[PDB]
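Appendix B. Extra example for self-study. Work through it before the problem class; the solution is given directly after the inputs so you can check yourself.
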Amino acid sequence: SGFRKMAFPSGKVEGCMVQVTCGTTTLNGLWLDDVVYCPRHVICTNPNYEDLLIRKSNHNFLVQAGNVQLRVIGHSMQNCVLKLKVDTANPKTPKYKFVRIQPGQTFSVLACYNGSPSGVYQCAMRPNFTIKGSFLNGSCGSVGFNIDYDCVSFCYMHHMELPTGVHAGTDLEGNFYGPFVDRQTAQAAGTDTTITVNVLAWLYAAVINGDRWFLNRFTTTLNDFNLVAMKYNYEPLTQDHVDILGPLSAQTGIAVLDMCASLKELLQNGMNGRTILGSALLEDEFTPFDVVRQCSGVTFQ
Amino acid sequence: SGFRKMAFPSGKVEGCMVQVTCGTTTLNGLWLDDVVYCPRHVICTNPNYEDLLIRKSNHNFLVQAGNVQLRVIGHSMQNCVLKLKVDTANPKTPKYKFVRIQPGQTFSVLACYNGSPSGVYQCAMRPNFTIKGSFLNGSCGSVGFNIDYDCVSFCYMHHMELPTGVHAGTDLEGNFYGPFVDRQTAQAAGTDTTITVNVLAWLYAAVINGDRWFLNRFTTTLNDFNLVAMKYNYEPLTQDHVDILGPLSAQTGIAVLDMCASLKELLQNGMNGRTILGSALLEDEFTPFDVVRQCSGVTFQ
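Solution. Structure tokens for the complete assembly:
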């Protein structure tokens, strides 16, 4: 029992983190097999990166894997990431994939500086394709990831901070999440919404942990819920969401639409100074999979 | 910018986690050099563990380090932990120490099942010597830890769940945190308090991140604060706490006693539907060191 914002063990990823220096820019890179991936705004000198990359040489890129120097024998650009071919394959390369996630899905972030990992935390891809991360100068190139049994699914590379303090970046093929670019504009985040299906999974987690004060006798239809959800800036709930919540409904005997009715009441009345799972807010950064994982017992390696 | 419940990178610790089986009991153990540490209630068959350990043989203890079997060549008891001497030193042994923490200090937990790490999360040692963790059957033997540069400071081994759903365990010399024992009684947690000095560090983190709505013109003395703190079940604030907050006071120009006055007002009025750092509650599981680390940029390895 208990419920915590939990991240994946980060060891498999620590073994891939390296430092990349060019000119007076230093950031983090990801070393898998014989390629080092990093953001392309590491190249020298409003931008046209194809111009700038042709005016460059392999020997301009310094790459540190701990103490050991790494010898760059080739480069190329893929969308907003840079691929630096080095002469040594990473012996610590885990089984991996490059995977792009959907708004509402969660991943773990390994924040890094100068190639040295600093910390690990859990977070979600907001519906407006930002993430509320924690980053300081030099964290460029840190990656986000999930782990399934023994395989590391990389889903995110960090690129920049937006004026509101939230963060933006790309998948590992170099394609940005959301309408952002790797050059200086007045870009801003769109207006965000709350991830409805996740709030309901979190409520099931509370029931499984002995909080039931918010439960009620009422029920409601999908349509009448969504009418109330949109009033409070909540995502619509789909029939697929109702199926994905099925297993959690079974374990507790609370029908999905019954729990919707409790959420409707919580939105219309607030919590009256009570708390759920140690929180005075409705939490939306836990998916149904996350809740089942933390209450059933699944491990990895 | 941004502020997140952050844990230490867990790789150095994953390399020490092993599985220990005896009789029909299976739990996790910690493998450093040529010793495997694990809770002693793994021994067979209200208890007297010295009786039970003398009726046992090295070959009763099965130890799995991944696939490889480990050969137990000796055993001994240290307080509530068991030391199992094996014939192989762990090549992945990091530089480490065994260190006992104080209520109010934080550490990272690597939750484990059958020797396989499952997840990593941050938490605090409550003033009543419990921790609000997340654990399921089989997590016995998982450890908590801090990392300072390259050295792993182990501070916790998990032992049991208490009737309220909170957790209890020992340091790595086998001495329990708090008035709990490794046998079945009606033991319960004492009444808890809120960690005052941590709430103030969290408020400084909010100021550093652009939340200032709770700041005020007032001030207050140490004595008049503590009179209000004790009313709301808050720890007393000491002059040492005021010194430890010094550097954060400097960075922001908010005098420690000025911020106390804001906390006094927050306690007497509530937040009026506003939030601080994404939270509708006053958070008390971040220390001054934690806040400086996450806003200055210190890494490890």
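Self-check: Residues 193-296 of chain A form a domain with the main proteinase (3clpro) structure, domain 3 fold (CATH 1.10.1840.10). If your reasoning did not lead you there, revisit section 3.
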